[PDB]
């Protein structure tokens, strides 16, 4: 039954899958690969990797109608907390060959599970680092267009602002997913969310906040602009 037609965002596709329903999905950059064991589907000449909102936040972000999305073919993005690559694998599809991604995990065991991928899919650069230290990678990255921060850690608000001065280029965006207990497990979700926004708006302009429900609970994705 599957039908596949262009979604609003460049590098995103909508599918009317078996029954009636709608899911998003992205063109596989390297046909034949399968990263996180997700549903590929075949279309005219080509394979589109489904992207499940329950797996990637940024997927859930977009199914919840993320308004504006700086990550588009050709763009150079810095990715903090790239992990296995389940979440960043998809942006690779989007970004494309003249696109470039700088992935940064910290635990060496997880990032490992990525390193073999980057042979087939060569627009990614796994870099074992700590976001808390931007300079440790000072010589492995070039100024980026989008910064992307996942990394559930209390200081994550400042993490973004730091990297942002180091790397993010004037007037490019960056967007962060916040889990809220990452920051403070005691005080009320909106209040931390609201605090986080202020701490950001001190450096950026916070041009959006989007809560990630039903998929993920008590998270929210923000996107900010660098003046």
């Amino acid at each position: 039954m599957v039908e596949v037609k262009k979604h609003k965002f460049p590098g995103v596709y909508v599918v009317i899958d078996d029954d009636g329903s709608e899911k998003i999905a992205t063109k596989n950059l390297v046909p034949g690969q399968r990263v996180y064991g997700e549903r590929v589907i075949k279309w005219e000449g080509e394979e589109y990797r489904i992207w499940n909102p329950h797996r990637s936040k940024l997927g859930a972000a977009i199914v919840n109608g993320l308004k504006n999305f700086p990550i588009k073919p050709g763009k150079s993005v810095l990715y903090l907390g790239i992990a296995s690559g389940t979440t960043a694998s998809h942006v690779s599809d989007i970004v494309g060959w003249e696109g470039k991604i700088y992935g940064i995990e910290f635990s060496p065991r997880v990032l490992r599970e990525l390193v073999p991928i980057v042979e087939e899919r060569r627009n990614i650069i796994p870099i074992l680092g700590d976001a808390t230290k931007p300079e440790e990678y000072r010589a492995l990255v070039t100024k980026v267009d989008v910064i992307f921060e996942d990394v559930a850690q209390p200081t994550q608000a400042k993490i973004l602002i730091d990297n942002a001065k180091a790397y993010l280029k004037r007037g490019g965006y960056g967007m962060i997913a916040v889990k809220s207990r990452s920051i403070d497990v005691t005080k009320e979700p909106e209040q931390v969310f609201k605090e986080v926004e202020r701490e950001l708006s001190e450096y950026f302009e916070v041009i959006e906040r989007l809560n990630l429900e039903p998929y993920e609970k008590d998270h929210a994705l923000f996107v900010v602009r660098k003046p």
Partner: protein, 363 residues
């Protein structure tokens, strides 16, 4: 001024301009590891001397240690992030790297990483468990081979036994100083040794109850000392190992209680799988054999001290209080174990903070 590339170390003029550059002479993956870490190499020092050469006392770096140990080199430097240089290079890399500059940042990049990441293994939890015990053996061995070199060398110099009670120095005395008459102020200080220590002994050297040894008796004892000294060295490289494999085994446990106490807890476990697989109650009390006496010969009540009590927070905290604090660290440990076993995701700072703020209290 001075920023590092995936190709060479560049020093830029105060405005925008080049000045000079040094290319990585070995494998760039290798050099960078040191430079990125804050470490200073020769490729760097070859540069700065050349920069002094053109008359620059002015110095700036992107890392805090590159500047702090640059001053430990002479030159007055300072730390500033995205400084004029890093900004220059990362701004438009193909200026310096040609058009294929990314394909480059890529190779040096995937290359540097495969270096720092340990190969897939499933035994490495039990490898740390040897290495942790294998350093407790090296600890029997050392107290023992010092016990020898202490009284044997005291035949020749009884005094200095309780003079330099700190072992690593007694040893290096015997190892370099050698014969009782080789000792002099100059080489006595080169050993550590306060301005009094260099006397409190030098007085004893000059008159002593000491027996007499010749180039042969000495030459053996000084050969026991060259072994103590390589055993110490064998210690450094054993913990150095632990603290690097914890990265690949329990990033969290390591980030929570420290790489050593992590590996220790992994030890009286049976490994990680067991450490992970069990309660927090079977954790707080682990190393519990010795708390202390009061019925061995006297009379009193029994209770217990498990390993994790060396947590500086459990330690500087008192009687009354405390073990309520053990109850806690035990739990965050059980969580650390599981994510560490199954995932590897660094969730540490989350529950590190969940713990800190935790169980503030009644006194």
């Amino acid at each position: 001024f001075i920023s590092e590339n995936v190709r060479g170390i560049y020093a830029f003029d105060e405005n925008g301009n080049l000045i000079e550059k040094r290319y990585f002479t070995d494998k760039p993956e290798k050099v960078l590891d040191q430079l990125l870490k804050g470490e200073i190499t020769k490729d760097l020092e070859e540069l700065l001397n050349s920069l002094k050469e053109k008359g620059y006392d002015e110095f700036v770096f992107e890392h805090p240690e590159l500047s702090r140990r640059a001053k430990e080199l002479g030159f007055s430097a300072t730390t500033e992030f995205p400084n004029i240089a890093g900004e220059r290079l990362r701004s438009n890399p193909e200026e310096f790297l040609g058009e294929n500059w990314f394909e480059e940042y890529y190779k040096v990049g995937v290359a540097l990483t495969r270096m720092r990441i340990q190969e897939q293994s499933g035994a490495r939890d039990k490898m740390v468990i040897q290495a942790i015990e294998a350093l407790d053996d090296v600890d029997k061995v050392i107290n023992l081979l010092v016990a020898r070199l202490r009284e044997w060398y005291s035949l020749h110099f009884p005094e200095l036994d309780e003079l330099l009670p700190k072992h690593p120095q007694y040893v290096a005395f015997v190892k370099t100083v050698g014969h009782r008459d080789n000792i002099n102020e100059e080489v006595l200080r080169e050993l550590g040794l306060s301005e009094e220590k260099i006397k409190k002994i030098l007085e004893a050297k000059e008159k002593t109850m000491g027996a007499w040894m010749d180039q042969t008796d000495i030459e053996v004892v000084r050969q026991l000392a060259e072994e103590i000294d390589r055993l110490y060295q064998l210690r450094k490289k054993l913990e150095d190992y632990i603290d690097r494999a914890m990265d690949d085994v329990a990033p969290n446990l390591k980030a929570l209680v420290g790489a050593k106490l992590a590996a220790r807890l992994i030890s009286l476990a049976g490994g990680l799988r067991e450490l992970a697989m069990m309660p927090s109650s079977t954790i707080q009390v682990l190393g519990a054999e010795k708390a202390l006496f009061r019925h061995l010969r006297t009379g009193a009540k029994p209770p217990k001290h498990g390993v994790i009590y060396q947590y500086p927070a459990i330690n500087r905290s008192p009687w009354w209080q405390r073990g309520k604090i053990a109850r806690a660290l035990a739990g965050k440990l059980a969580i650390a174990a599981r994510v560490d076993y199954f995932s590897g995701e660094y969730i540490a700072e989350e529950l590190k903070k969940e713990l800190e703020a935790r169980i503030r209290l009644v006194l």
